[PDB]
From a paper:
The [name] of coronaviruses mediates viral entry by binding host receptor with the S1 subunit and fusing viral and cellular membranes with the S2 subunit, thereby determining viral host range and tissue tropism. As a class I viral fusion protein, the spike exists on the envelope of virion as a homotrimer and each monomer contains more than 1000 amino acid residues that can be cleaved into S1 and S2 subunits. In this study, we report the cryo-EM structures of the [name]-[name] and [name] spike trimers at 2.83 and 2.38 Å resolution, respectively. The overall structures of [name] and [name]-[name] spikes we determined here resemble the previously reported prefusion structures of coronaviruses spikes. Both spike trimers have a mushroom-like shape (~150 Å in height and ~115 Å in width), consisting of a cap mainly formed by β-sheets of the S1 subunit, a central stalk mainly formed by α-helices of the S2 subunit, and a root formed by twisted β-sheets and loops of the S2 subunit.
The newly identified porcine [name]-[name] isolates are also found to share ~95% sequence identity with Rhinolophus bat coronavirus [name], and this further stressed the severe results of coronavirus spillover from bats to domestic animals. Recently it was shown that [name]-[name] is able to infect cells from a broad range of species including mouse, chicken, pig, monkey, and human, indicating a high potential of the [name]-[name] for interspecies transmission. For the [name]-[name], ﻿receptor analysis indicated that none of the known coronavirus protein receptors including ACE2, DPP4, and APN are essential for cell entry. The final refined model of [name]-[name] spike contains residues 19–998 with some short breaks (residues 82–83, 134–143, and 488–490) and 45 N-linked glycans. Sequence analysis suggested that the S1/S2 protease cleavage site at the boundary between the S1 and S2 subunits is R544-M545 in [name] spike and R546-M547 in [name]-[name] spike. The amino acid identity between [name] and [name]-[name] spikes is 86%, and these two spike structures are quite similar with the root mean square deviation (r.m.s.d.) being 0.53 Å for 962 aligned Cα atoms of the monomer and 0.56 Å for 2886 aligned Cα atoms of the trimer. The SD1 and SD2 of the S1 subunit and the S2 subunit are highly similar in amino acid sequence (85, 84, and 95% identities) and structure (Cα r.m.s.d. less than 0.5 Å) between [name] and [name]-[name] spikes. The NTD has the lowest sequence identity of 70% among all domains. The CTD sequence identity between [name] and [name]-[name] spikes is 82%, and the Cα r.m.s.d. between these two CTDs is 1.1 Å, also indicating more structural variations in the CTD in comparison with the highly conserved SD1, SD2, and S2 subunit. Therefore, the sequence and/or structural variations indicate that [name] and [name]-[name] would also bind different host receptors by NTD and/or CTD of the S1 subunit, although their receptors in bat and pig are unknown and the receptor-binding sites on spike have not been defined.
Residue numbers in the entry:
A (entry chain B): 245 to 487, 491 to 585
B (entry chain B): 829 to 998
C (entry chain A): 586 to 926
D (entry chain C): 586 to 634
The structure:
Amino acid sequence: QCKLRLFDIPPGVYSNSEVEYPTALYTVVHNMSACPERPDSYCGSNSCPFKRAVFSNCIVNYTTWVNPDQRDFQHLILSNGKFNPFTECNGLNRIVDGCVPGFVLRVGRGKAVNRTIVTPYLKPYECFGWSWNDNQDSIYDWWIADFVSTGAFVCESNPEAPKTGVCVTYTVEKVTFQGVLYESNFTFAQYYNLLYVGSQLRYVRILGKVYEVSSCFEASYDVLYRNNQSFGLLYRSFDCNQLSARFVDRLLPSHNGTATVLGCLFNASYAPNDTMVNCTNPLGDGFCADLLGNVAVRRMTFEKHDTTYVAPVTNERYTEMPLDHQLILTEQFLQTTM
Amino acid sequence: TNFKVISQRLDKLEADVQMDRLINGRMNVLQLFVTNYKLKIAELRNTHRYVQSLINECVYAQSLRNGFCGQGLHVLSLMQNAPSGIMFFHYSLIPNNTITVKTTPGLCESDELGSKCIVAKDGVLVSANLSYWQWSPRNLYKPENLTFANVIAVSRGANYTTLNKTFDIP
Amino acid sequence: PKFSVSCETYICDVSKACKNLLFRYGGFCQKVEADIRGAGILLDGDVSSLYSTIAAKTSSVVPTTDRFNVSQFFLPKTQSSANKYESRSAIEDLLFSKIETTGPGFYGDYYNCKKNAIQDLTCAQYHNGILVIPPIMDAETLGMYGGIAAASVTLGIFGGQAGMATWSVAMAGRLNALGVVQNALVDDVNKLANGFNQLTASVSKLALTTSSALQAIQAVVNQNAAQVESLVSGITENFGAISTNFKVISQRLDKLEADVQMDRLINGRMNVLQLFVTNYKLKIAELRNTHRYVQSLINECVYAQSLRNGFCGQGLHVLSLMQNAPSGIMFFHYSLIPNNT
Amino acid sequence: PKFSVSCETYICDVSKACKNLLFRYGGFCQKVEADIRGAGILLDGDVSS
Ligand SMILES: *[C@@H]1O[C@H](CO)[C@@H](O[C@@H]2O[C@H](CO)[C@@H](O[C@@H]3O[C@H](CO)[C@@H](O)[C@H](O)[C@@H]3O)[C@H](O)[C@H]2NC(C)=O)[C@H](O)[C@H]1NC(C)=O
Ligand SMILES: *[C@@H]1O[C@H](CO)[C@@H](O[C@@H]2O[C@H](CO)[C@@H](O)[C@H](O)[C@H]2NC(C)=O)[C@H](O)[C@H]1NC(C)=O
Ligand SMILES: *[C@@H]1O[C@H](CO)[C@@H](O[C@@H]2O[C@H](CO)[C@@H](O)[C@H](O)[C@H]2NC(C)=O)[C@H](O)[C@H]1NC(C)=O
Ligand SMILES: *[C@@H]1O[C@H](CO)[C@@H](O)[C@H](O)[C@H]1NC(C)=O
Ligand SMILES: *[C@@H]1O[C@H](CO)[C@@H](O)[C@H](O)[C@H]1NC(C)=O
Ligand SMILES: *[C@@H]1O[C@H](CO)[C@@H](O)[C@H](O)[C@H]1NC(C)=O
């Protein structure tokens, strides 16, 4: 109804209804090491250059940039998702969820007067926050991240091997695509993780394993609609020669899709012998949807005509001459104006 | 959608990328109109050369083209106005029941060169498995006996049919 | 081939953040689907009137082809008692094999499914919200002189009133009507049968660098595959954006940059889809009148004897036969032109 | 009249800074030249017949 924008759907054939599938986002396709820590922002004698850390191609860890007391750092808490080490960002988007392009981090420390902490001006790709070393003594530590490169990809939780044999819309190295994967013995060049045969994605390489990408053939179907309790399904791009929970909770057989030249047919009769002369519901490729007693797929046929050409008679033979005629009327419409 | 409001509410960096969205948006709708309109004119240049042939040959004449004024033997075509075009009504005779009969280019009394021969006038010679020949119109089996002023007295031709009799036509 | 396009899945794949911004454009998604479905109606109207013209009455008593090798070249290849129903003729198989496909891709997979013609195997394909549906009759699977919409081989030279026994008798009376032989003997007809047989066996030696009829078929195959490939190249590339994922663009930039770079993917993808719909309607509007020319060559050259100079080829028209080609129909015209004077 | 169109010179005349940004559009320069050369073939086919 929401695809057709109607409440009382008349009988017909309604095409290209689609099926949803999960999402798998990969920013990097290989596992990494662990990140360094923070340098505590404490100096030995009186004052020394504050130690920095380069974060790239590693796994930052949860809340290991603050002290384990859960009263002081809580000014950097937003919501249930609260692990946000930045306060005002320039000019990138402030919330850090997922992955960030590989900053360099420098820390610091200062005395807190007025209980108000000021914002130094930021060049773009510099975003900073501040925590408390100790809150009742009012000494705050801070850190600013300088994203020196785009595409170093510090990321939590190293990615894992995908599920082979289910349609899911992947996103692997800035290229989102949909399909199923399978293990392959195909090897290609180490410069590349993606592979194209022409213009279609054919192989991906995830964690050193090469997976051949196949199109998931059950993403689209037609409905051979008759009423609320009787309709048929046709999957025009699926080949059910050999080998489902979406259809077990609509109609009786799990399996038992008929393999036709139109696609895989479900809960409809396939009668390629029988013909119809007035096809008010064509399916394509010579077929017709009969939607009057129940759901059935028949063959289309045409009424045969003759010619006014008569071959002239040059010897004695048999001829087939008409006994009477029928007057017909042919309306022909042609557009002449706008 | 008001161009004054957009420029009196935002700064001149945002009020010039959002006036390039109304303008670039509206230029596309108007340009897609003009392309679809020229796509229809270019189609009707040749549809008019087909309408003018059906008026001159089906409606204002009798045509000799098979299947042009509908299928069959063309009796009449009339033409009416339709919404945004013209509608032609074609009336034709198509065959209904058939019959298999014997037929011949013509009949001769004897198989010598110089015998009297006949052919049919304005129709065909048929028999329908009888001992004697008959005359029918060329597109309908409706037999008549042979008569003076129904056949034509000719010479021979390529393979006429010999009766070894004389014609009953006085 | 008919298409069925879901506009939202092409442009804004699963992103609800993207589907809110398509709503601000002025009826775009309604307009694309109404033009594809409207042009798929007009094409189904023309193919249906075409196969009501191909479908002709045949004799119950089939005349014998004496020395004309008609059934070898034009009639469907005689089905065995096995799982090999080759519905094409011998010429129709030569026309699909001499036409090369462009390269690997999505039209090459579609074209090779039709060329192979495996029984009860679907050729429809789905990618990214774009389905390839066969048309109402789909000539690329059929043979012209066999099946349910089968053409008549005999209706054009034996005429509307059946009864002549062989093709030698029929071609003898056609040579009389052309004014070249008063009464044709067996050597005048065999000379016509040998020329017919050598000219049809020479179709097997056509080269795409020389034949202007294969170049017309190849021009249709090359423009079908260049249109599919523009539609697949439109969703593998950012159009000035940073990526193709709409969540990543909005969770990495501020809301001034993540809304001018979501207007680059969307405005970029709306152009590729709109250029598809314009080129598709440009082909339907061309074939409205090409169908009125095909129906005249079937009724006047193939199913009758015509009196129009040069219409069925140059010269005194002996015979016209018709075969299926990739994405169209091919007419074979046989004519007598003068040689010595 | 037949045309022959070099897409890069029309849009991004000599600028290498411009020619890098045409590369991001989805096969534009390939598509324009294939349609001009394809329509110049069909016109040469009709004038020859
Ligand atoms: C005049 O005589 C001719 C010749 O005897 C008659 O034509 C013949 O009619 C028979 C009866 O229909 C045809 O035989 C049938 O053929 C079909 C198809 O093969 C088959 O299904 C039937 O069981 C039967 O065998 C025969 O073909 C036909 N002969 C020719 C040369 O066409 C004709 O009917 C007679 N006309 C009248 C008005 O008596
Ligand atoms: C047409 O001609 C035939 C023969 O020339 C006529 O058939 C004869 O009919 C009479 C009685 O009607 C019979 O006594 C003869 O024996 C018939 N002759 C033959 C050879 O069968 C027929 O009657 C004529 N019909 C008309 C309307 O004049
Ligand atoms: C037209 O058909 C005839 C009959 O099939 C062909 O003649 C045969 O050719 C084969 C060659 O493979 C010989 O083995 C037969 O002995 C021939 N039969 C007769 C009756 O001659 C003929 O070659 C065909 N013509 C063309 C041009 O293909
Ligand atoms: C599907 O088959 C089952 C068989 O019991 C039944 O519900 C019905 O006949 C068919 N159609 C639908 C819509 O369920
Ligand atoms: C009906 O179809 C089956 C399989 O397609 C075939 O074996 C059978 O001969 C057909 N019957 C008729 C009467 O056409
Ligand atoms: C007619 O007479 C001639 C001469 O006797 C004979 O050869 C021929 O067979 C006869 N034909 C018929 C139909 O009686």
